Design a protein around this ligand. Structure first.
Ligand SMILES: [Zn+2]
Lengths: 49, 50, 65
């Protein structure tokens, strides 16, 4: 919603235009939330495009 | 061709950088033109080249 | 089309090292020293990054949007 008039680079024009693997969110099933502390279950590299 | 006339002509289409002459941005990019790579208006290209 | 996630031969994660690689090319780095700085020792990952063509943005230029 807020960008420069030109904004040639896609970074300024767009948001979430690169789906990095950090967007993956773990959805616990059953009691997996209690067994695994938060942040343990996640993609390893966090930066894969 | 006399040097004064050439200097007058080049002062209208070029600028002096480090003793050399570089064509003006608007000459390369007409007002109706756009970037072949991004499609941005020629005014932004002129500002960037300036 | 897009950078593969894994190296074909060895299997090292190479997908996350693409955009940073471009940064090293946006900087003054050459190809070889940028690949060395990224940590690609064996030549297979160097072939993966060096020979990859980024067609995803050119295709996105033709996306509906
Ligand atoms: Zn490899």
């Amino acid at each position: 919603p807020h960008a420069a008039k030109d904004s040639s680079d896609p970074n300024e024009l767009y948001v979430n235009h690169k789906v990095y693997t950090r967007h993956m969110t773990w959805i616990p099933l059953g009691n997996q939330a209690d067994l695994f502390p938060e942040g343990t279950i996640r993609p390893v590299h966090d930066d894969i495009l | 061709i006399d040097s004064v006339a050439v200097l007058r002509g080049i002062q209208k289409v070029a600028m002096l950088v480090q003793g050399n002459w570089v064509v003006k941005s608007d000459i390369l990019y007409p007002k109706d033109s756009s970037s072949p790579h991004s499609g941005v208006p020629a005014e932004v290209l002129c500002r960037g080249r300036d | 089309m897009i950078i593969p996630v894994r190296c074909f031969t060895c299997g090292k994660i190479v997908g996350n090292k693409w955009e940073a690689y471009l940064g090293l090319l946006q900087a003054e780095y050459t190809e070889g020293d940028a690949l060395d700085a990224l940590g690609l020792k064996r030549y297979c990952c160097r072939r993966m990054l060096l020979a990859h063509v980024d067609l995803i943005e050119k295709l996105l230029n033709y996306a509906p949007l």
